[PDB]
Ligand binder design. Structure first.
Ligand SMILES: [Mg+2]
Ligand SMILES: [Mg+2]
Lengths: 361, 361
């Protein structure tokens, strides 16, 4: 009754809004067209190739291997589509993401409903945006946190380098005037060894309220650290597909996850993981490795289905870039947003920015 | 004093010697040339894209992302080369493999020594080849096991489907006349759920001597099963880089591993893992996902450095294909082989078979 007739891949250079990130992004955007003419869009944009086992060339290569096997399938059967992608290629959540998201776009358009409504129904609360406080001198970090607070942000992500003594001063300053209505995350991006994590935690003065995200690079190290601290731990890099989330629960390894759409594998896997976390009482932040307006659409729709008490902000990933790839109303107002109310993802890509497809199936 | 001047990538179709595998291979071969003219070779050939998170297009895409960063580095500093590959791209052991192996080839040629001698020194014992018994009717499997026994093979790998009742009959028949000098492996290739693994193990009659390889798809399932059985367990698909091997030890999860060169990340990582296993008392089989004569060279040199008591056969991966990519003397004789004694890997590629490079850096 409805079949995938074509899968087109586009490539877009997305300049970094921060100029240069020390220690532009190559975005992969996919358009799926059904036999009836409905078009759906999805995106997968890795944060370089050093964040997790993912890179731009890898995303497109993965799509090339899977795409042929998807032609003729019903895009509305999102779980079956994912089963099919899994049968064609193991892992590669980053390559599967854009395809899955596009199917959801088509799905919503086919029944005339916003994606969040097909994901269980939209909540009646707004979505808090989270700030990104890059590593710098303690006072600089504190000032930037203040700038965001003055813009209405209620969530802040403080990055650290991995050098415990200075990091301690950075966290102390960054949280200097934290308020009762703010949620703070200290993100180590897997840069701490257990030794360094313990040294950092022991150096911190009392009174600092935050959750520690991605403390160490490997599962073993994070578990080892978990046994020696009472600080809330959030998995990000190590939280990949739904099988990894179940492992977190089996190991009582953390208190929540940073659910990045393209690391999870799309909205379908995002839903699977959402339900695992909500069933367990884990907190969930919805973000992305990186991405334009299209990737942001997926973030907002998934987040709009997570009860406020369980949500830990969302990342307006498009803030990381300077090129607009699509139009959409996300109702942004002083640090908060809400999912659109039109069919599908609620976005309309700018074909001129996408250029001609780099691949077609 | 010695630097990488060029990295060329070749692609070779390798027809399956078994005709068609149910439920040809695309081989990636790399040639590294130093500024002084020394050439080294390496290979990475995935067993399709369903075995592990690896595919042909992915191997080459990974090389494209890493290669530029390697130009100018000393190929002899194998561990530093691997550190550099890690700095350019996380994971992707499959893409790193061919480059690492080629550096070892260069390394051995530069000092006029076989790779196994630079890996710690060759043992004085022969390397037993292992058979591959594809799934079939019980009697057919038993007959094929007999065929290999009659050829002098002392190692046998019996594959199963994942259907416990029939699998039990298959294992019973396949091992019907196993001898005192033979080592048997039953490989589930991660196809058993804990439920199915338990049902299979409970159905088997007493007296069957074998080690169970890759029983379940995920780490959690394998640990769960480990707690409910006393059968030796060997990790294959889940044994990836050295960090995973340390995790096996931390979890007391298995008795040994199936070390596949391209899954491990090359000879350097192979050495790292070898030492972890030998230090622990874990058994080690040296194989490959798939591969021609070049990939086979890496297998033999690593295996020739593992004490006989700890080795669990090697896979003559080239037996899986019908196209010869290089000449080399592996001293094959009735189910046994030994590493060559000439410099480097001891192989000379057939340039005519490789065709023109598909990529150059
Ligand atoms: Mg993070
Ligand atoms: Mg195996």
């Amino acid at each position: 009754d409805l079949k995938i007739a074509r899968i087109d891949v586009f490539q877009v250079d997305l300049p970094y809004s921060g100029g240069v990130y020390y220690l532009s992004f190559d975005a992969t955007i996919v358009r799926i067209t059904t036999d009836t003419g409905i078009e759906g869009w999805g995106e997968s944009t890795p944060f370089g190739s050093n964040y997790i086992a993912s890179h731009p060339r890898g995303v497109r290569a993965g799509i090339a291997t899977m795409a042929p096997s998807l032609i003729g399938l019903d895009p509305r059967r999102v779980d079956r589509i994912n089963d099919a992608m899994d049968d064609a290629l193991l892992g590669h959540e980053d390559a599967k993401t854009a395809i899955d998201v596009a199917c959801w776009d088509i799905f919503g358009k086919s029944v005339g409903l916003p994606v969040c409504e097909l994901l269980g129904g939209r909540t009646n609360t707004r979505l808090p945006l989270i700030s990104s406080i890059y590593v710098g001198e303690p006072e600089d970090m504190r000032a930037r946190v203040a700038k965001y607070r003055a813009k209405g942000y209620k969530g802040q992500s403080v990055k650290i380098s991995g050098e415990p003594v200075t990091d301690a001063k950075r966290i102390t300053a960054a949280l200097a005037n934290q308020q009762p209505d703010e949620f703070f995350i200290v993100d180590a991006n897997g840069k701490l060894s257990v030794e360094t994590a313990l040294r950092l935690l022991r150096l911190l003065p009392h009174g600092l309220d935050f959750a520690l995200e991605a403390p160490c690079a490997t599962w073993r190290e994070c578990i080892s650290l978990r046994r020696k601290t009472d600080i809330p731990i959030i998995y990000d890099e190590l939280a990949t597909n739904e099988m990894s989330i179940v492992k977190i629960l089996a190991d009582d390894a953390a208190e929540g996850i940073d659910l990045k759409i393209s690391k999870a594998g799309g909205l379908t896997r995002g839903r699977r993981q959402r339900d695992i976390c909500l069933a367990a009482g884990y907190s969930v932040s919805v973000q992305e490795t990186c991405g334009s307006d299209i990737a942001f659409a997926a973030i907002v729709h998934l987040a709009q289905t997570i009860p406020e008490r369980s949500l830990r902000c969302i990342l307006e990933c498009r803030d990381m870039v300077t090129v607009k790839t699509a139009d959409g109303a996300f109702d942004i107002q002083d640090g908060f947003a809400t999912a659109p109310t039109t069919p599908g993802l609620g976005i309309m890509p700018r074909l001129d920015v996408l250029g001609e497809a780099v691949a077609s199936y």
